[PDB]
């Protein structure tokens, strides 16, 4: 009935209308609170133990303050009370659909359990949505400030996931195609989901960040673009959307890929599905499902969070114990070692299919070295990595639009070579990690020698300590040296 | 093999030594990453999601950056790495004992479940400690690295509980040690500097205390024939102000009303599920919430997953358990009904006797419904400076530049007229478990009758609230 | 005219009105980029560059932030533009008075040069303004834009200084809310302080999380005594008292710092001896002294910190003893600080004149001595400002109540008012502070003042005399 | 005793008595009256920071790198006396900076004086030798255990770099000592200390945000033997940091240090110094009068030459400098000269550019005819510090396995998201005339001028010219 007032390091004081109060007091949405937003990156970055939960009122925050500045720039856009709370709850339920560890469960888990189903976080977000409105009576709510639940719910779910099929879009019209840019962005990628994880992340992780996304709010506009109205930025802020970008590359490097946190992702990912048949999960009509079906219902779906990881640890089922054995490791700090790192060479890719044929690949080579020991494919886990500036291939850039301080409704595009030729000329590649399950000495001196010969055989990037860990290789290759 | 670095957002990158290393990396210490420094805080503070095992790190790192201070500045005091280390190993052990969403275990389930026990964190950590250096074979690694595990294991549970010279961990000539992870002479430790960092941090509030600057003015002097950590005669305001800004944030944030609700109903859910789970401990046997306190294999598994545990249980037993937790998500809380505080030096002594107190005043108002004992919750917050009515920095020992190992006593008309003068009080919170308009209505009126039968402290919205009531207290209006 | 941004590292991105700009954009506030905020401060806190202009920036938008916050959430109170941009250049425009060092100038040098005359920056802020003003050509922008500049003039003024019974005329008792905004006469507590405390703690390097935007988002109107004034909400009442004690202690640790102070003062004491000699070119081509320059604003415009680097760099011979003192300053060979103690111009003498029982080498003076007497209080004199502070509860937001000391905490100050004297030595030989040590601390004893922290170590043949201290 | 002082970047900071003595100088206080950023303080209103600060903050994080690498390595025997001379060196390295900084060395040195090479750095070991003469530190550096030959000579190497064909040009430290060279002022690849401070610095009053990690860094660095010499290596997964350190100075340059108004004021300013030099007289040695182009050739003189110069022109009552002041009195007013536009060049002394658009002929009509005169052009070079080449080709790396041999790590090792050129130009136009008419037919020049050059499409060209900018076929 009256507005609620949340404090977040962040952003500071938040102001919650009462119906964002009524879907954030739900079970589906306070889920959120117990899923950690980077996953294995806690056990890295201590810092790191926000959740996916205080992440989302940020985005929600943020998604209300760039709507509500673009209506009082420009009120001709009639901007409502009602767009506004279902941007608002759009951006508040983006990250609903989250499993335990976040990206681990959409980015490892799911594939690895269910390769034939496709899935993501994004699709997991509409079905909870969908879910929680339900189960909570929150449409008669919804009618009651003014929101009508057909044409809204359509609305924040194409906000989430896109269109569920001119103009594809049902929730609203051409005219109101900017409101469509500003939670999740499918046409570049500029959205307040990034403004609130970069800031909220660095908090935690302890990298620092002066930056505003804030700026960028203040410098929006809308413009036709193509017989639509779409948000453009001020044309000098475009070197600041470059950054966000690299910003977003580094963040990647230095934290989101860490290689021990990556490790632990993996490990996690494989207790999981060792555990996966043993752990039964309560759904709708008290049907039981497994960690890796809890997916096709949402009842189910619910009950899904980090906790799974301390109920495998706990659990006392020999059924459990290989599954257990692992999380056990992983609290000894037992971990896999990192061997090296190297990159596809030229226009080669590696694709996905193929990932697991690359331990027994790097098992096969034969480095002309003596050997204490010898590696079998199982000792290795090869993890590749994919860096983009979040369009594959694409720059992002030469997806948005601007405007300049001259003409502000005249919008305009603008290519690289205007910016810097100091930026990027490709937007994507790929890391490849090598670990080893064997962690003593000799063995690892072992993979060492395996590793630089593989990328050797495979003409991949010479690992920038390949002279120190395998000098005797390092000269077979003439590019190397 | 060597040291790692680990950053931390407060005090960025920390460097820990092997041994320290080998420590953390166990089931007993990594616990602290699933139980919450300020418990039922988070469901306020969204930025709170900190946990007990961060702060650890942090108070670990700070143990180690005043003892090296120390050594630095004063090579005479025979500093070792020995002693390094078993402050550290302190500092990062110090909250090993800690339950489900940390106070409110040992602050509100544990006195309920266990009326008979005096139980603390603090008794948890030492034998949690004692628990995880057997069972990961950490006393072999403790001698490789110069360290007397006999000796050393009394010193460090000695910091963390204190007496077991009433210490034989180490000598008065060493008693400045015992002043560092938790200071039982006066409060002024390094638990204290992290916390206030950390929970600010994540909170969204301002800290007064500097604590790099207190580590670089330490010094240790002689004080009654023992070697004490004193302070520099002009930080004197500084530590006036930590203890400031440590009332401000049990105001702001440990205590606020609807925190300590919820760590309430949690507690409750909790006694009602006590019988109902069972935690496996030391050779399979099962334990309960209440009773893994005894076994510290069962206690190693009590986390705040506990919560979910209940949460997610389709138990028919444990349903009036579960329906609490429900209540919570839903938001659907038990109401704040007001705030008061006895009269002047006057104080309450431990409660259970209180609702009733409530129920038991008339208030001369007409009233739909009548409300019982247990449709009531007292809170009873006790607010102090650490030292019960004790004023903590009279027991403080300070020096002057000119003559800087001459300890000395500063008293607090010294400093500042505008200083506290009483260092404790009470608050009483009263709650209402109906939450109906009418019923909190009602509540309010019984609340604000028995303030003033009581003569307690007026209400800030007694006018509001209880219009009819407040008139007949003269004092009041 | 457009509307620009600033990005403001407090605050972030500014967005600020033409009008505000065209008013900005002056030699009488640019004049503020090159006035210390904390004067003497900077030569203790090296991050303690800022300058007074930045701070007025910050303190006109958290005006606007504020006066715009009430309005959304009130729009009964028909708050207009014209308000909005009335508060706004008020607190743009409320530290135009300041002088060189900011408050060494009105707090110690025109005190010592003018004692006859009653001179404050608030004073200062409105000549300034008025200057600017008419200097400018401002009144008609201000027309262009919907101010009246009769009344609209007279509201600004009065938010700076108070009245020049409702007492005010720019503003009728409806709108009495506006006046406590940007320099609250009631009870200080004002969007002045919220900027300040994160400018000054950022430069400092004092760690500050806390939010004035949580008491802006907090605060409301409401009727108290017929006037409609700024209420907060009943729970912010712990956040006030603090918002005092860091207050204090910003003041203890830094604006107090006594090396700043002595600073200061070294400051103050050659400008006196250059005062003469360094002429002011005013309007009409006039010349001032920079005693005077307060009497004429075009002079006054060109009175800034430049001046200390004018007589530091200096030749004339005239100026020796003024440019001596400031080069003394930066070999940081400085006034002493003897001591402080806790009970203007007859102080130094009376130190002087007790007599220590003690063996002294030599014999000092009163003009060797600098007594500084330091008011630490809540801004209110004697009085506790939260005792002058309306709230309001949830359940009845309209409705303001008031809030005594003991309904919040009894571990609150009993007092709001002290003094810290301390005393300085100018000769600085360690025979000469030696014996200034034993003055200090007699006259201490002499007074009943309290025992210097110290006073054992200092003075240890001076301090058994006193039965009290022991 | 060692004095503490507080940094809003660093905290609290020893300080070696030595130290203080040094900075207790008039020629180091002088510092505190030059702002880092010069102009861009009238942008940046949190930019108020001057030299002084910046500073200690390189003195500072000196120490803390040649510390570290002495604790972590104690058989480099670092010394005291060492730890002591590469903070002072950090101490002293930006005393040769003269009002408004870049703007003094950059802008109004180069007009005022084309035939005398200078640089703030040449400025800085002069300062340095007369701050030591001036103030008999050197008796007091002997008192500490400093030998002034040697350790004078090994200041003024780190702070310039060789004083002189040679494995080793420097005289003050042998080559065992080689790393030290690097901690202050890095020839070799120009990571060191100042840019660190500068970043963390800068961004706090900017309000802005800084990528580099320089904490992290110092913990990671070590020597290793390279080619002979005993140099400072990074652990080999900081390579990505680096490129960032990099990447965050270049965009601190566009967003900040050559913000096209904070340029434009340089440039007002510089003039107004132009106008005023004659007039302005700067008393030196032996009460001998300098002009503010001449004050560098006398350090009494130049030791008095400061921000407040600026402020003496603005406030003279005096009528000589009628022309100068007004111009500053024009800054003050907001009265600036007008930004037309940017480009860039395909390709890459003074005098002829701004002749070169007024040349252009655009096929516009115009209602005003402009003349070079009426034009600034301003030329900006960005880079990797290292003109043309990338810096981290010139690091050295070592590995945990073998900490204590060195690699070297290329770009393909690294990325292939990096750039691929670490140089490029941007062009600046300004226009003196600021009325409507007078901008609009500026802006069609500009335009014309970029398409006859082949130069890059404006941003904005198609809204400034719409009529020039259809005639140019590539801009799409
Ligand atoms: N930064 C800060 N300082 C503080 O002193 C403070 N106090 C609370 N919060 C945070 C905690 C929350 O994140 C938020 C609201 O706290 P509130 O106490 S205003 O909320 P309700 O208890 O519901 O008061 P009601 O029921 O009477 O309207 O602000 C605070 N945040
Ligand atoms: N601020 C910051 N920036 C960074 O780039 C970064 N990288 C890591 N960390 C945090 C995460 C950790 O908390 C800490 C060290 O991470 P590290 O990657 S050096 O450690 P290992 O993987 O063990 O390196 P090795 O095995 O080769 O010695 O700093 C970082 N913290
Ligand atoms: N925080 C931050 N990041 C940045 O990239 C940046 N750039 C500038 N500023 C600061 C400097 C100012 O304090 C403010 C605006 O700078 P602007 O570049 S938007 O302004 P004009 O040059 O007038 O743009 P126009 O004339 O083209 O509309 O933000 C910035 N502030
Ligand atoms: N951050 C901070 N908090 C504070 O409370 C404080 N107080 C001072 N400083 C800063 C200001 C200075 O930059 C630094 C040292 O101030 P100091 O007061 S220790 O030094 P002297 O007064 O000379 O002490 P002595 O009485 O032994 O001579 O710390 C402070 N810095
Ligand atoms: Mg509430
Ligand atoms: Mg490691
Ligand atoms: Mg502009
Ligand atoms: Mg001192
Ligand atoms: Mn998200
Ligand atoms: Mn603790
Ligand atoms: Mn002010
Ligand atoms: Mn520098």
């Given at each position: 009935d009256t507005m609620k007032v949340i404090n977040d390091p962040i952003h500071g004081h938040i102001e919650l209308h009462p119906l964002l109060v009524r879907i954030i007091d739900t079970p589906q949405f306070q889920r959120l609170r117990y899923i950690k937003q980077l996953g294995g990156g806690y056990y890295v970055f201590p810092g790191a133990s926000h959740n996916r939960f205080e992440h989302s009122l940020g985005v929600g925050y943020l998604a209300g303050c760039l709507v509500h500045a673009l209506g009082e720039k420009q009120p001709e856009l009639q901007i409502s009370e009602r767009d506004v709370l279902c941007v608002q709850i759009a951006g508040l339920c983006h990250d609903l659909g989250h499993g335990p560890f976040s990206h681990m469960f959409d980015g490892r888990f799911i594939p690895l359990a269910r390769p034939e189903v496709k899935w993501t976080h994004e699709q997991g977000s509409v079905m909870m949505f969908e879910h929680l409105i339900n189960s909570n009576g929150i449409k008669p709510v919804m009618e009651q400030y003014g929101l009508i639940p057909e044409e809204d719910i359509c609305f924040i779910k194409e906000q989430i996931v896109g269109p569920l099929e001119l103009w594809p879009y049902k929730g609203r019209p051409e005219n109101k195609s900017f409101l469509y840019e500003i939670v999740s962005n499918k046409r570049n990628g500029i959205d307040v989901d990034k403004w609130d994880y970069f800031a909220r992340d660095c908090h935690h992780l302890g990298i620092q960040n002066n930056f505003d996304y804030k700026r960028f709010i203040k410098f929006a506009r809308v413009c036709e673009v193509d017989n639509e109205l779409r948000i453009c930025a001020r044309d000098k802020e475009v070197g600041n959307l470059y950054d966000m970008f690299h910003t977003r590359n580094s963040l990647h490097r230095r934290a989101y890929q860490h290689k021990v946190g990556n490790i632990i992702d993996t490990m996690i990912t494989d207790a999981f599905l060792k555990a996966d048949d043993y752990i039964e999960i309560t759904g709708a009509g008290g049907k039981k499902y497994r960690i890796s079906t809890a997916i096709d219902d949402m009842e189910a779906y619910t009950k899904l969070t980090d906790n799974i990881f301390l109920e495998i640890l706990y659990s006392?089922?020999?059924?459990?114990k290989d599954a257990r054995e692992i999380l056990k490791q992983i609290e000894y700090r037992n971990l896999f070692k990192y061997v090296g790192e190297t990159q596809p060479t030229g226009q080669i890719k590696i694709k996905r299919e193929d990932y697991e044929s690359l331990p027994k690949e790097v098992a096969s080579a034969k480095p002309k070295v003596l050997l204490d020991v010898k590696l079998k494919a199982e000792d290795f886990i090869?993890?590749?990595?994919?860096?983009?500036?979040?369009?594959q291939e694409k720059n992002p850039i030469d997806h948005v639009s601007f405007y300049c301080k001259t003409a502000p409704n005249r919008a305009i595009r603008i290519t690289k070579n205007q910016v810097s030729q100091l930026l990027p000329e490709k937007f994507a590649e790929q890391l490849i990690r090598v670990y080893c399950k064997k962690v003593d000495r000799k063995s690892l001196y072992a993979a060492r020698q395996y590793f630089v010969q593989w990328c050797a055989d495979r003409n991949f990037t010479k690992p920038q300590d390949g002279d120190v860990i395998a000098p005797?290789?390092?000269?077979?290759?003439?590019?190397?040296?």
């Open positions: 006392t089922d020999p059924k459990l090869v993890d590749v990595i994919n860096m983009d500036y979040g369009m005797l290789i390092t000269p077979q290759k003439k590019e190397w040296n």
